[PDB]
Nucleic acid binder design. Structure first.
Ligand SMILES: [Zn+2]
Lengths: 83, 65, 149, 101, 145
RNA sequence: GCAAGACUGCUAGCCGAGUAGUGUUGGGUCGCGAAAGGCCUUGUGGUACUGCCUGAUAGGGUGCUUGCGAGUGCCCCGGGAGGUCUCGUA
RNA sequence: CCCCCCCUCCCGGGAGAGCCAUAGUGGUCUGCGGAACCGGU
RNA sequence: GCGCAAGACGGACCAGAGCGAAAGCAUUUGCCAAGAAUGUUUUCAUUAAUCAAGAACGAAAGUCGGAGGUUCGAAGACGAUCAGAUACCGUCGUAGUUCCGACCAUAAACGAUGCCGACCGGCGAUGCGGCGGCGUUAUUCCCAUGACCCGCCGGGCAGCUUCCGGGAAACCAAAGUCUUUGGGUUCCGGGGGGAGUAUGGUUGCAAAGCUGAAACUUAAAGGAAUUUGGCGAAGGGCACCACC
């Protein structure tokens, strides 16, 4: 309360707060690397795609537009790519 | 009334203590959460303590509305 | 809050701190610009071009793969639209509201919304006039809707 | 001076509510201010219950219940002794009256 | 419809529910869903079936209101309308009256609405007979055994 | 290729067999389910219940006993005995 | 002598998709290693 | 009891719940257009807040022209209460109550509190969108979705407590961060009557709407809260000078 440490907040506190209320503005979104057992070529998609995407190779519809994230088609593996 | 004799028989009962400890029981019923808490303070496993099954069912807080 | 509605909101983008292209993105600048040119030739606007590039091609945003923004690139090549996208959308919305109002004369709320939309159009056109992108004699007129589609 | 934190009703973000009619009176009053009373009552109380029960065509029968809702204006609600005045700090208590009968 | 002698013959004309039951079914902290369908049987017996449904509270639910979204209510009403119009046009009145003796239509609607919002009771609270065909004697004498 | 652990479903002989059929809201590699017959080692032990309906001894409905509140009791067949089952009171 | 009964108590047996130990058994997960890397079809 | 015709209307579900700038908004379905919030690693880059002139909407009553007039009901007719009622009450009952136009622009149009923006305590609920996680259910297995539960995030109507603070107090997380007085910008108050009157302008067929004094007169008029006063207010106690 009176004596906190706003310079070095714990990660739990920082992740609790809103994205624009943190000590530094950092989005909570991320990119994905989605692929399916059917086709054997891998694409890169955004978490909140908000747009229907067709796999390059006309395999099937991969993502689905929703309010938040994207409803990944069943039978697909994805990993969180980061630098 | 502030009594100093304090009900002689009940005062003796207060003086009476049992031969058993009533606390140093050989079996302790604790959830895994308490075991995880204890594992990270200074010490680890014990020889007079065992973990119980997770008592989480549906929820607490019976319906009132 | 909102300029016209009395509602307060907080929902928009939040760019990351690190201003560097990610290493997993193998795309160069030339091919990104080529894709931008192709999408522009297809008949889209910079509002959706960035969306398509950040969804399918995996690029975060243009301002890091290249230096010029999307509208800057379109102006550089020359196939950029003559009228701003937001002003075009506002004009189209005003035309739609007026077309709805021609038949139903008792919809007072539609009249109020049309007044608000025309106010927004005037306020944006004033900024365009003072920033030297539209001719000084350009005026928004109620009847002129067919030409400005 | 202002007596209640609210305005004697429950309208906080509406500005208008449907007007209803009193039952004892004919006064037209706002819905959220008009005291609403819901009563559960049987056809017979304690006199004709036996006469219906033992003297009946069918056996093992449950008596029907008459259902009705009441709307009372403030003057009509107080004149019929449905609600009564309370103390200054006792008016802030929103708990319903005890029910055990 | 006809009397032979010292013995009158009848026919189905409608069905209603007890007013006390209907009063007791409509309670607080629940949404009532209504739907009227004007569907004709195989023969020219046009009926206007009505429906009533309510939502209730789960055994572990804490929310006292337990309301429903407007779109969920619309979907439930569409389901009830389709269920009633499906079990009328395919059969005559003579045995759908027998079907009406139990709450088979009500049970079907209740089972069909488990996915949108769980309702407890489905009742055809009123059935009216709007139109009837040309008067016939053979059907009448077949109705009475 | 080394390699031991943690857990799970069904059968309480195995085979045919998760065959027919039932089935659900959107799907699926699916819930539900004894065999006809055969081949034989020829078919595991302790443990309490069971109001009515729907669709398990699960889940969801809904009771009977004294006005009322808590009990005991409420699947079936075979023996014996008895006849107002227990505590408080709008 | 009444009844038809209905209920309660002391025992035996039948049915179930209860639980627990043993067999017929089917899969999920975890540890180590591939003499060392960079590109072209 | 069975059928027919006409008009108004949308009970119970209905909540200190929702939407709309305000007035205001409820039977199912179909069509058209719009909006707040949540999500966003999309787009432009100061396009911003409040506002003299001006402009749209604006409850019921109010007027003008058509169609309908079921019910309620100004004026009016009648009967009783009453000393006196052309008041309370009861029966009829025109204009209006309904719709399509043409007008007025008025309320206790009240949160009696202007808008934008920053900050300073806590605690549970509710409605929306997003997010994480055991477990039941759409019968028993696999996933997505509804329903249930445990949290978190943002905006919105509100709730409870307190020596943050303030006020004359009633009370207020704003009616606070104000003599230790300066965030930005509009309207408006100067003791009580006369008086929102006369007048002049102005809009309206009219009713009336906006702007709006002076002469004379008074030392009071007013806001909050206690003890007795009285109630044709509620709720308790006692008495054979009260009763059974
Ligand atoms: Zn009244």
């Amino acid at each position: 309360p009176l004596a906190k440490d706003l310079l070095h907040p714990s990660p739990e506190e920082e992740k609790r707060k809103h994205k624009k209320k943190r000590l530094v503005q950092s989005p909570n979104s991320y990119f994905m690397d989605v692929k399916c057992p059917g086709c054997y070529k891998i694409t890169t998609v955004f978490s909140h795609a908000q747009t229907v995407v067709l796999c390059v190779g006309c395999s099937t519809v991969l993502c689905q537009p929703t309010g938040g994230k994207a409803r990944l088609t069943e039978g697909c593996s994805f990993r969180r790519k980061q630098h | 009334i502030s009594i100093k004799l304090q009900e002689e028989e009940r005062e003796r009962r207060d003086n009476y203590v049992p031969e058993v400890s009533a606390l140093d029981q050989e079996i302790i019923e604790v959830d895994p959460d308490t075991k995880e808490m204890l594992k990270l303070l200074d010490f680890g496993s014990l020889s007079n303590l065992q973990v119980t099954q997770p008592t989480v069912g549906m929820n607490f807080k019976t319906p009132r509305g | 809050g909102r300029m016209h509605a009395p509602g307060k909101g907080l929902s928009q983008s939040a760019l990351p701190y690190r201003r560097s292209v990610p290493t997993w993105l193998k795309l160069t600048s030339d091919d990104v610009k080529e894709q931008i040119y192709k999408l522009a030739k297809k008949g889209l606007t910079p509002s959706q071009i960035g969306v398509i590039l950040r969804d399918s091609h995996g690029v975060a945003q243009v301002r890091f793969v290249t230096g010029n923004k999307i509208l800057r690139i379109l102006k550089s090549k020359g196939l950029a639209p003559d009228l701003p996208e937001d002003l075009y959308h506002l004009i189209k919305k005003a035309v739609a509201v007026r077309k709805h109002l021609e038949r139903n004369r008792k919809d007072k709320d539609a009249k109020f919304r049309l007044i608000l939309i025309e106010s927004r159009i005037h306020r944006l056109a004033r900024y365009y006039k003072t920033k030297r992108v539209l001719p000084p004699n350009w005026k928004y007129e109620s009847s002129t809707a067919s030409a400005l589609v | 001076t202002k007596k209640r934190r609210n305005n004697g009703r429950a309208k906080k973000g509406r500005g208008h509510v449907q007007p209803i009619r009193c039952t004892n009176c004919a006064r037209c009053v706002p819905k959220d201010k008009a005291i609403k009373k819901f009563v559960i009552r049987n056809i017979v109380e304690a006199a004709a219950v036996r006469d219906i029960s033992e003297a009946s065509v069918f056996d093992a029968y449950v008596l029907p219940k008459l259902y009705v809702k009441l709307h009372y204006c403030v003057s009509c609600a107080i004149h019929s002794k449905v609600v009564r005045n309370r103390s200054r700090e006792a008016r802030k208590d929103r708990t319903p009256p005890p029910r055990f009968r | 419809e006809d009397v032979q002698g010292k013995n009158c013959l009848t026919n189905f004309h409608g069905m209603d529910l007890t007013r006390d039951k209907m009063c007791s079914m409509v309670k607080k902290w629940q949404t009532m869903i209504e739907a009227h369908v004007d569907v004709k049987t195989t023969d020219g017996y046009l009926l206007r079936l009505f429906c009533v449904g309510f939502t209730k509270k789960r055994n572990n639910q804490i929310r006292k209101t337990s309301y429903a979204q407007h779109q969920q209510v619309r979907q439930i009403r569409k389901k009830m309308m389709e269920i009633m119009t499906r079990e009328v046009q395919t059969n005559d009145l003579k045995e759908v009256v027998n079907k009406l003796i139990p709450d088979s239509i009500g049970k079907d609607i209740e089972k069909a609405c488990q996915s949108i919002y769980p309702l407890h009771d489905v009742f055809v609270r009123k059935v009216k007979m709007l139109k009837k065909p040309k008067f016939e004697l053979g059907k009448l004498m077949e109705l009475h055994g």
